[PDB]
Swiss-Prot record, chains A, C, D:
The protein, known as: Actin, alpha skeletal muscle
GO terms of molecular function: actin monomer binding; ATP binding; calcium ion binding; calcium-dependent protein binding; cytoskeletal motor activator activity; hydrolase activity; identical protein binding; magnesium ion binding
Pfam family, one: Actin
Alphabetical keyword list: Acetylation, ADP-ribosylation, ATP-binding, Cytoplasm, Cytoskeleton, Hydrolase, Methylation, Muscle protein, Nucleotide-binding, Oxidation
PROSITE patterns reported in the protein's UniProt record: ACTINS_1, ACTINS_2, ACTINS_ACT_LIKE
Residue numbers bearing the Tele-methylhistidine modification: H73
Further remarks about this protein from its record: In vertebrates 3 main groups of actin isoforms, alpha, beta and gamma have been identified. The alpha actins are found in muscle tissues and are a major constituent of the contractile apparatus. The beta and gamma actins coexist in most cell types as components of the cytoskeleton and as mediators of internal cell motility.
N6-methyllysine sites (modified residues): K84
Organism: Oryctolagus cuniculus (Rabbit)
Described function: Actins are highly conserved proteins that are involved in various types of cell motility and are ubiquitously expressed in all eukaryotic cells.
Modified residues (N-acetylaspartate): D1
InterPro entries associated with the record: Actin, Actin/actin-like_CS, Actin_CS, ATPase_NBD
Curated annotation (Swiss-Prot), chain B:
Sequence similarity: Belongs to the TRAFAC class myosin-kinesin ATPase superfamily. Myosin family.
Function: Motor protein that may participate in process critical to neuronal development and function such as cell migration, neurite outgrowth and vesicular transport.
Portion of the full sequence shown: 444 to 516 of 1136
Protein name: Unconventional myosin-Ib
Organism of origin: Rattus norvegicus (Rat)
Lineage: Eukaryota, Metazoa, Chordata, Craniata, Vertebrata
Length: 375, 73, 375, 375
């Protein structure tokens, strides 16, 4: 429980549930958003086997489970599994009663309507929270950024999206949503590791490839110069010990894995890339905003924890932007939590406390109340 | 009424200055005084020159970058 | 506030509010007469966003505002917005109490009656000034001209008008009013910049085009010789860096923009032009006045700050006037403020102090008191 | 080829190339102005794959292409791609030699100068036409309207524009150009279909959303009454079968998609709307013209093929116009081709045959010859 009735912030973005109380600088519960179910028979009698394992426990027991992410591309697809994720979030990891704490859910912009409606329905009807508020995730990243002016991208596990904001005013006609993120980079890394000779196809082995992506991948500045550098010798080739076995040795896959985030034609996705959707999100704004966006380009979320993504980002945008502009890629080491941290700052505001969606008016109006009071 | 004007968690002056120390962006003293001119205008005992409901606007004895509180003294 | 109760002069002509105290050589407050209102949602909580921004602050925040001039062609059209302009004029820019200072408002000749009546109503009833006086703007330009004999044009942002005066006596049958001024030249410059390839349609981009007009435009002496000169080569072509972006390069638009002021058929306005309304304003006077008008042709206001407008003016009028006349175009560098400066000189006169319209007689007679005591 | 040397009319406005011979009541070639290029590897050997597919063939093969409109907002942006569009127009669809037929190109008013200059350069230098003529598109809509007096809007795929004409005389100071048209309505429909739950982001899926816009959208008369009507029940909700798959079911998006054309704040464009730019285009004319404009308000082009746009148009303009005026919205079922049809009528005139811009004088003067002889 909690000594106070301080509001909860539950960032459940697409692939890593992180949650805690308001006023904290870091979430108290960080666990992957997986639901593992056993696919083999239980032969030992009276052990204490469960029906489904949730989160970090499913990450431990993954050798005898199948792992299902209940949320994909920022869209919740298994509502009973996501109910297990939230039940594990409040009752097991936080160990708190949700009937006493307001909750601040995060979504992605340009999401389905039934996502936020049914998420509101499960928050009020199943868990009985006193008040809730669903907010756009990159706006919250700009809260923890300490700025009221800037264009933001977060790049979670399922969705990257640019939200440009000038002087506190949202520019919703210029919000870009690109469904290319860390889970797609994990699948592409599974493909190119299959190219080298290491066949990972199991969902547990998919988590192994995710760990390879987190530990060994980095963003190149010039993809052909690093590509010919890896083609020259074994200078950048790095080895990784697999869980419970042998050692693999990966080469150019270190930078071919996140280059898909800049060149989405690698995974076959016709789009402009993360730098060009950032630049197009700047150019779809009004003109006298634009330099303040270039000086406050905020890259403060998830997947963008690669080494050298800020230099590549400033190189590509500075190549796209006109001269005599100051392009500043704000990329703090507070990333991968700053969408949550700005959730804590937004929940800790005094004037925000009228903007909560409570009971009684949800109970007056129904699940469309978010489309009244959320952005 | 006075204590409430400073104590209140949603429009009190300590809550507004706690918010101004918390809220992002350009935080000066001028923006805090303008926030007090926004969220304490329809209060009886708050007194500032640039308040929106001000009957102390033409009060020449109130300098800018200042405000009055109607204490018992 | 002010150490004295010295009278205020508030020249609010059509597009640039400039105001100050009497006895000054220059106005203490110069800001554009705009009211900007936000057209986008406020997504950052507790920032300090306002309902409407006035003047220079609206000029700064113009990327997220819409800009509305409350006064057009010298006629006030939004009285609540103009009340915001005056409230910002006395209380924010000057920081003074209007209950202690007489005010000297300026209008254009041949104006609507409800303009000066309702302006008198807002001065006495809303702001509670002790005395006011509304005066014709070009007469005030002849005060700062240092002459009691001359024909005056000012060319503000909304109206140009000739007032011929001989030996202190107004000639009101010969007052010309032409509704062609700097805002129309801004719109025509938006059209011909659209012709070159630069599309400005936003009100903020309209202010950008106004800055292009102020910085790069000039009046040609022979429009076909400068026209064929620009058609010959790139000699007069000048480049301008846009706010927050790229560099444009404009050519003949430098002199096609103010030539509309001499040839009003460019914007489709059937009239004679500024030189021919000046000459017709001279010829509608009595005959033994006329040479003293030609020797004291005063061009001392707003829009006429173009380079080479005095040479074009003396060329066209000298072409229209008969020979053996001395045509002298009085065009000081004290322009764009001389209508205010003569407001200060008129307010600083000792014998003028009975001509103020005070309380008690406004309170006796009502808002028609200006039509008793103003010209 | 053709039995005669009858002049060609090639209306290539912004998003749908339609062309034919003069004297016809309908264009012989109608195809979308797209250039599709393959983004995947050709794995079948000796099939007959091309480098780029143009028009209707690119509309068929769009599942393995990327689609690029070479002209956007009435401005040609890819001249080599537009050269493919014209080459496909004369040689593939019409199957004719352009060296024997005069051509009548259409542009939008207030266009870039290098558009008509370089379009003239490609017509004479690449295709070697004997004579050409570039004309303003809404003027041509007034030719097929059968009137010499009226204000016209066409609303193509990239630009809507009002041209008021009285007794055959153009009023070019009152021409309105608004860059809000069917491609912007397609993008906004992609956004609000993303709101419902259907994610279309591919350029082929953009063409699917364009087909949804053409088949299911209509203009509401009162947006709040139809909005609350769709909020009341499922009365106006209509379903659409996607290409090669499932059935979607769209509701209020049917009238929120074209309401952006009346309220441009939906796509974030600060403007007055199509009814208020029509009314302002009327009010910027001379006074004794205005009723003849109201009785001959012509709405005879592209995007305005929505159901109920004439009733909404007459409602809004009749609300804006003073009483005792006869407001008549001329909206024939000959729309979407009447800009071409008046191209045929203008090319079929006898006295027009001196107004063609031929060789030899283009060859004397260069590409500025249109700025001599076109409007
Ligand atoms: N160190 C890292 N480097 C690369 N990728 C990472 C790293 N850490 C996280 N990721 C990826 O980012 C995803 C989580 O993103 P996050 O922003 O936490 O999303 P959420 O909105 O669910 O809070 C992870 O699932 C993983 O794919
Ligand atoms: N240096 C300049 N060159 C050309 N035009 C100018 C210049 N400065 C100002 N202007 C035009 O003149 C207008 C200012 O006129 P002004 O006389 O100040 O108007 P008002 O009648 O409101 O005082 C501006 O709107 C601008 O368009
Ligand atoms: N029946 C319809 N309903 C709604 N929109 C339509 C309809 N038919 C065409 N449109 C829109 O109009 C556009 C075609 O306009 P058109 O005038 O042919 O363009 P262009 O100016 O390139 O010739 C299409 O892109 C489509 O979006
Ligand atoms: Mg998250
Ligand atoms: Mg003036
Ligand atoms: Mg066309």
């Amino acid at each position: 429980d909690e000594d106070e009735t301080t509001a909860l912030v539950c960032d459940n973005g697409s692939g890593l549930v992180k949650a805690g109380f308001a006023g904290d600088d870091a979430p108290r519960a960080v666990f992957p958003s997986i639901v593992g179910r056993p696919r083999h028979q239980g032969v030992m009698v009276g052990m204490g086997q469960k029906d489904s394992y949730v989160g970090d426990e499913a990450q431990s027991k993954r050798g005898i489970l199948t792992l299902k992410y209940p949320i994909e591309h920022g869209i919740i697809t298994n509502w009973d599994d996501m109910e297990k994720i939230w039940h594990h979030t409040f009752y097991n990891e936080l160990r708190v009663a949700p009937e006493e704490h307001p909750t601040l859910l995060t979504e992605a912009p340009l999401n389905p309507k039934a996502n936020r409606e049914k998420m509101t329905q499960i928050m009020f009807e199943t868990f009985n929270v006193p008040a809730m508020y669903v907010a756009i995730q990159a706006v919250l990243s700009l809260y923890a950024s300490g700025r009221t002016t800037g264009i933001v991208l977060d790049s979670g596990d399922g969705v990257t999206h640019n939200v440009p904001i000038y002087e506190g005013y949202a520019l919703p006609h210029a919000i870009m949503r690109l469904d290319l993120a860390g889970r797609d980079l994990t699948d592409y890394l599974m493909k190119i590791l299959t190219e080298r000779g290491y066949s990972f196809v199991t969902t547990a082995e998919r988590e192994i490839v995710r760990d390879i992506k987190e530990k060994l991948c980095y963003v190149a500045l010039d993809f052909e110069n690093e590509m010919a550098t890896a083609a020259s010798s074994s200078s950048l080739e790095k080895s990784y010990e697999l869980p419970d076995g042998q050692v693999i040795t990966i080469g150019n896959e270190r930078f071919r894995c996140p280059e898909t985030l800049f060149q989405p034609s690698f995974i076959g996705m016709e789009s402009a890339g993360i730098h060009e959707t950032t630049y197009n999100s700047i150019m779809k704004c009004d003109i006298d905003i634009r330099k303040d966006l270039y000086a406050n380009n905020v890259m403060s979320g998830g997947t963008t924890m690669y080494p050298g993504i800020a230099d590549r980002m400033q190189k590509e945008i500075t190549a796209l932007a006109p001269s005599t502009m100051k392009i500043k890629i704000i990329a703090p080491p507070e990333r991968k939590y700053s969408v949550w941290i700005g959730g804590s700052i937004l929940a800790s505001l005094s004037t925000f406390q009228q903007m909560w969606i409570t009971k009684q008016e949800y109970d007056e109006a129904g699940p469309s109340i978010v489309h009244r009071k959320c952005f | 009424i006075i204590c409430d004007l400073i104590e209140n968690n949603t429009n009190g002056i300590l809550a507004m200055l706690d918010e101004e120390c918390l809220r992002p962006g350009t935080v000066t003293d001028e923006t805090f005084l303008e926030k007090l001119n926004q969220v304490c205008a329809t209060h009886q005992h708050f007194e500032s020159r640039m308040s929106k409901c001000s009957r102390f606007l033409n009060d020449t004895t109130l300098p800018h970058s200042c405000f009055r509180i109607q204490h018992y003294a």
